[PDB]
From a paper:
Laminins (Lm) are key components of basement membranes (BMs). The Lm polymer node, which constitutes the repeating unit of Lm lattice, is a flexible N-glycosylated heterotrimer consisting of α, β and γ subunits that join together through their N-terminal short arms, while the C-terminal long arms form a coiled-coil, from which extends a cluster of globular domains that bind to cell surface receptors. Laminin polymerization is the major step in basement membranes assembly. Lm polymerization, first described by Yurchenco and colleagues, is a nucleation-propagation assembly with an initial calcium-independent oligomerization step involving β and γ subunits, followed by a calcium-dependent aggregation step, in which α associates with the β-γ dimer.
We employed cryo-EM to determine a 3.7 Å structure of Lm complex consisting of 56 kDa α1, 64 kDa β1, and 52 kDa γ1, assembled into a functional trimer. The asymmetric cryo-EM structure of the Lm polymer node resembles a triskelion with centrally located LN domains and three rod-like structures projecting outwards, each containing one or two LE domains. The first LE domains pack against the outer surfaces of β-sheets from LN domains, creating a bend ranging from 110 degrees to 130 degrees between LN domains and LE rods. The interface involving α1 and γ1 is larger than interfaces formed by α1-β1 and β1-γ1 (1372.2 Å2, 1227.4 Å2 and 1138 Å2, respectively). The interface involving α1 and γ1 differs from other inter-subunit interfaces, as it is mainly electrostatic in nature and it involves a calcium-binding site from γ16, the latter fact with implications for the mechanism of sequential assembly of LM trimer. The cryo-EM structure reveals that the α1-γ1 interface involves a loop spanning residues K58-Q72 in α1, and another loop from γ1 containing residues L106-T116. The loop from γ1 consists of amino acids critical for coordination of a calcium ion, including D108 and T1166. We propose that in the absence of a calcium ion the loop in γ1 is not structured, hence the α1-γ1 interface cannot be formed, explaining the calcium dependence for the assembly of a trimeric Lm node. The γ1D266R mutation stabilizing the complex is located at the γ1-β1 interface. The MS glycopeptide analysis revealed eight unique N-glycosylation sites, which colocalize with protrusions in the 3D Coulomb map.
Author numbering:
A (entry chain G): 37 to 341
B (entry chain B): 29 to 335
C (entry chain A): 28 to 332
Write the structure that this text describes.
């Protein structure tokens, strides 16, 4: 749907391509090993190394574990994984180790996925950014201590007619079952009562919009050896995610085909239907015949002169 | 600051150096080898082969060995092709760990081959088999396998319960069973008391099999010609623990009389510091009997005072 | 008495496909949330499906489903049409067996959400065995069947249940489905006579009607224009099956030892041993009018005296 009008005089709704929202973009992470010479190793079943007690080095690309390896082609021949600092830094806070993706425009994010290289964190969550420099709201809460960590009901659900914007807490990924390449995925329209009629739901349309996405790794799942505080035990727990998968489209509210990076070094929607703006939110001043509306499937949502 | 404060011994794998100390009443490849395979084999062009466990495993000469004493952790990239294979139609299978002295056990991970066993339980022995405790119960159906055992969330740190979180029906891709003696979050604090110490120190760990998953095809017959579809098999089991020293030294020297010039084993003899004596440093040494023995916690050395 | 040896019924049987990609020229399929493996340099993350090409990996027909050692066929990408949600797979065993279990595992797609397991004896009438849905709620709304609670158990020998535990999206890659028909039944040890025909069929139909979705299609849908959909957002949705292995016993009441292939009739039939009679070991020879013919049991062969 990269066209405005095919054969008729009136145009139709035009949607952008479903390109990945994390490809070839640098993600900012609070922590990153490599400048400190630090060794670590756990049960080596993840890869097959005899000990895997090597070091994180920033100067060695073949040994670095920074945020660059997080987003990439995700080739199955040689996966690239970002690794945080181990428990030597003591990763258990009221705060957390947070990594945030910057996009520069509102994107129609549909799903979020992660590929845990080493283990699923016991308690972690992923956050939103409705508008630039705006407040954060969460997608979903994965924790085995829903009532203790976030004080929320485990395996929560939203009934019909309720506030579907509010997130939930569930223990779907709490036990470290895969221990290698753990797949966790969340979709924006999962469990929403108004999902079927989402095209006529203003609340979902605004809520699904996102500019930046961050993950709050609250608690790191541990075997239970933290009591001894052994140095080998201390370095045997860490965070490692190999793929940061998030899907979305350049949200111009269905009034543009493609978004092109102009000389301002910022993305702008090539708005059609006599509109201009970051998301085609306003029609041209000469074309204020009718109020602006979302590009519904049935209608075209154009601005007459 | 081991001398000024307290340093705890490093925790490592137990199987390294203890591979020969494995026992089980279920091993294929006996004096009469027999075929053993399961439905839905994908990566192998041939359906299955013959178990031959009369020789220790070799990369090329003996690639079909399935002894319990040859299975190790992922030491080599050939981890995918080393494991032990049980017999046909076995319901009471048991494996155990043999320890020279009392060790500390906290958790074990076993990567199964075909199916997580229907019934799984751990048997505890803190006095070299004189008593027989239990850790936890795993069952596909708790009441069917272990009736009278509570099922659900955590109740107590040291309470035996039955959980189905590790007895699923889709373990083919090297599925493993997670067990933790001490909960990551349900532990209020570290008493370091005999109540928790006697419930954590282990002389001979015991793993028992009570049931095996059935796909329904073998429930209509009692013939030996079809029992080979169902069997237990573990890619690798790893047990992490440390030499018990009451928090005096951060390491244990190799056991005397052992000539293993390898890096990785975990011993059970602690050198004595802060004026103490004994195999595990359980008593103050000479001229320092003035104060009673006390454990070392945090930065408190709690060294025995001179008489 | 003595059932014949186990044989994989799916290996030597014919399989029919309702629709597979590649038969309509080239076809472009993008993995749901992830990129293509890096063998072809490919920013547009679709491997080219094909049906008539020189590269074996390009072609993905159903002739690689069971007979292939490790391969798969994928349903055509919905960009061709929305009607491709309903795809049926037929298992042509050519003879009536005693099916005990079925194994289905995907290759590069989530396990199908809504799909039925229909049996057949006469080749015309089809009776389903188990019902599958994306959620336990969908079982009551769509199939009007109460889903089972906790572990999948049978309250009756001939009961039919709707199980959603095998439709979870968590096993995104190589998701597995293990269906049992005897375990958990009240007459589990002794196969009840009514359970015999319930577990006996000649054709097993793997009717797939709905694909498991991450709400990608629901984000962009056009009810008014059903023939105009965004190719990119729908190319990520398709079925994929890589193994339909099935096992069972020959239906001759366990009065044989094996079921070797017969060159005379091109059919697989057990031998009529243990003093049995008839072409299919389903009768007793003349001279035993005192004892009417009846099938044997597990405990004894029940000779025709
Ligand atoms: C992820 C998010 O929305 N906000 C986090 C906040 O919770 C955290 O305290 C801070 C430092 O860790 O980083 C940011
Ligand atoms: C990412 O974008 C930059 C900007 O042009 C380009 O130079 C680089 O090659 C791109 N890398 C990938 C992997 O697409
Ligand atoms: C297992 O059980 C069978 C019969 O129930 C018995 O003959 C056999 O000795 C048992 N073996 C073990 C190791 O318990
Ligand atoms: C396409 O496939 C058909 C069979 O499905 C074949 O007859 C035809 O030659 C093929 N077209 C080619 C190879 O160009
Ligand atoms: C076979 O597929 C077509 C679409 O290609 C669909 O309309 C039809 O319903 C399917 N067959 C059955 C029996 O559902
Ligand atoms: Ca990567």
């Amino acid at each position: 749907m990269d066209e405005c009008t095919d054969e008729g005089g009136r145009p139709q709704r035009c949607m952008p391509e479903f390109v990945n929202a994390a490809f070839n973009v640098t993600v900012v992470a609070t922590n990153t090993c490599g400048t400190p010479p630090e060794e670590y190793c756990v049960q080596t079943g993840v890869t097959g190394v005899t000990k895997s007690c090597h070091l994180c080095d920033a100067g060695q690309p073949h040994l670095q574990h920074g945020a660059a390896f997080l987003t990439d082609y995700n080739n199955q021949a040689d996966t690239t994984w970002w690794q945080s600092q181990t428990m030597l830094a003591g990763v258990q806070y009221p705060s957390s180790i947070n990594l945030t993706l910057h996009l520069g425009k509102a994107f129609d994010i549909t799903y979020v996925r992660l590929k845990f290289h080493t283990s699923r964190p016991e308690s972690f969550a992923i956050y939103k950014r409705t508008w630039e420099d705006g407040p954060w709201i969460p997608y979903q809460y994965y924790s085995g201590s829903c009532e203790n960590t976030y004080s929320k009901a485990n395996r929560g659900f939203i009934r019909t007619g309720g506030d579907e914007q509010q997130a939930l807490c569930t223990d779907e990924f709490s036990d470290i079952s895969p221990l290698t390449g753990g797949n966790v995925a969340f979709s924006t329209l999962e469990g929403r009562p108004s999902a079927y009629n989402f095209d006529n739901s203003p609340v979902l349309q605004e809520w699904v919009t996102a500019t930046d996405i961050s993950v709050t790794l609250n608690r790191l799942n541990t075997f239970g050896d933290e009591v001894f505080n052994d140095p080998k035990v201390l370095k045997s727990y860490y965070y490692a995610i190999s793929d940061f998968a998030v899907g979305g489209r350049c949200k111009c509210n269905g009034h543009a085909s493609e978004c092109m990076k102009n000389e301002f070094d910022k993305l702008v929607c090539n708005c059609k239907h006599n509109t201009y703006g970051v998301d085609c939110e306003k029609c041209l001043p000469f074309f204020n015949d009718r109020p602006w509306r979302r590009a519904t499937a049935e209608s075209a949502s154009e601005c007459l002169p | 600051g081991c001398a000024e404060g307290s340093c705890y011994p490093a925790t490592g794998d137990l199987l390294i150096g203890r591979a020969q100390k494995l026992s089980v009443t279920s091993t294929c490849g006996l004096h009469k080898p027999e075929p053993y395979c399961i439905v839905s084999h994908l990566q192998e062009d041939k359906k299955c082969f013959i178990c031959n466990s009369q020789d220790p495993y070799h990369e090329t000469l003996n690639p079909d060995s399935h002894l319990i004493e040859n299975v190790v952790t992922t030491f080599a990239p050939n981890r995918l092709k080393i494991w032990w294979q049980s017999e046909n139609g076995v319901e009471n299978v048991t494996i155990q760990l043999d320890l020279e002295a009392e060790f500390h056990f906290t958790h074990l991970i076993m990567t199964f081959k075909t199916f997580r066993p229907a019934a799984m339980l751990i048997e505890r022995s803190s006095d070299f088999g004189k008593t027989w405790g239990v850790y936890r119960y795993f069952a596909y159906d708790c009441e069917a396998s272990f009736p009278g055992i509570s099922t659900g969330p955590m109740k107590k740190v040291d309470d035996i319960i039955c959980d189905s979180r590790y007895s699923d029906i889709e373990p083919s891709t090297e599925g493993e069973v997670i067990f933790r003696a001490l909960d990551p979050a349900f532990k209020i604090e570290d008493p370091y008391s005999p109540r928790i110490q006697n419930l954590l120190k282990i002389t001979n760990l015991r793993i028992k099999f009570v049931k095996l998953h059935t796909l329904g095809d073998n429930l209509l017959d009692s013939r030996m010609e079809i029992r080979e579809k169902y069997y237990y098999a573990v890619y690798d089991m790893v047990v992490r623990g440390n030499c018990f020293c009451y928090g005096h030294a951060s390491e244990c020297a190799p056991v005397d009389g052992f000539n293993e010039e390898v890096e990785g084993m975990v011993h059970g003899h602690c050198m004595c510091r802060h004026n103490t004596k004994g195999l595990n440093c359980e008593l103050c040494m000479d001229f320092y009997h003035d104060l009673p023995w006390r454990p070392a916690e945090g930065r408190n050395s709690n060294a025995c005072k001179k008489c | 008495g003595l059932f014949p040896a186990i044989l994989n019924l799916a290996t030597n049987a014919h399989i029919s496909a309702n629709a597979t990609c590649g038969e309509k020229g080239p076809e472009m399929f993008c993995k749901l949330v992830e990129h293509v493996p890096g063998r072809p340099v490919r920013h547009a993350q679709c491997r080219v499906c094909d049906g008539n090409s020189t590269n074996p990996r390009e072609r993905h027909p159903i002739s690689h489903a069971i007979d292939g050692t490790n391969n798969w066929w994928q349903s055509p990408s919905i960009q061709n049409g929305r009607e491709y949600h309903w795809v049926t797979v037929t298992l042509d065993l050519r003879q009536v067996f005693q099916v005990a279990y079925i194994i289905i595992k995907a290759a590069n797609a989530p396990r199908p959400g809504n799909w039925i397991l229909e049996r057949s004896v006469d080749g015309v009438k089809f009776k389903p065995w188990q019902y599958y849905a994306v959620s336990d709620t969908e079982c009551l709304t769509r199939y009007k069947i109460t889903p089972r609670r906790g572990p999948p158990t049978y309250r009756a020998d001939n009961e039919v249940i709707c199980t959603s535990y095998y439709s979870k999206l968590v096993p995104l890659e190589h998701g597995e489905i293990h269906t049992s028909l005897i375990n958990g039944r009240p007459s589990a040890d002794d196969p009840s006579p009514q359970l015999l025909e319930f577990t006996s069929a000649r054709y097993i139909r793997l009717r797939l009607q709905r694909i498991r979705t991450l709400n990608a299609d629901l984000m962009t849908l056009s009810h008014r224009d059903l023939r105009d959909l965004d190719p990119i957002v729908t190319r990520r949705y398709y079925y994929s099956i890589k193994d339909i292995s099935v096992g069972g016993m020959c239906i001759c009441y366990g009065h044989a030892s094996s079921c070797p292939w017969d060159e005379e009739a091109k059919q697989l039939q057990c031998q009529c041993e243990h003093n049995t009679c008839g072409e299919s070991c389903d009768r007793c020879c003349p001279g035993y009018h005192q004892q009417p013919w009846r099938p044997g049991t597990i405990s004894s062969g029940n000779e025709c005296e």
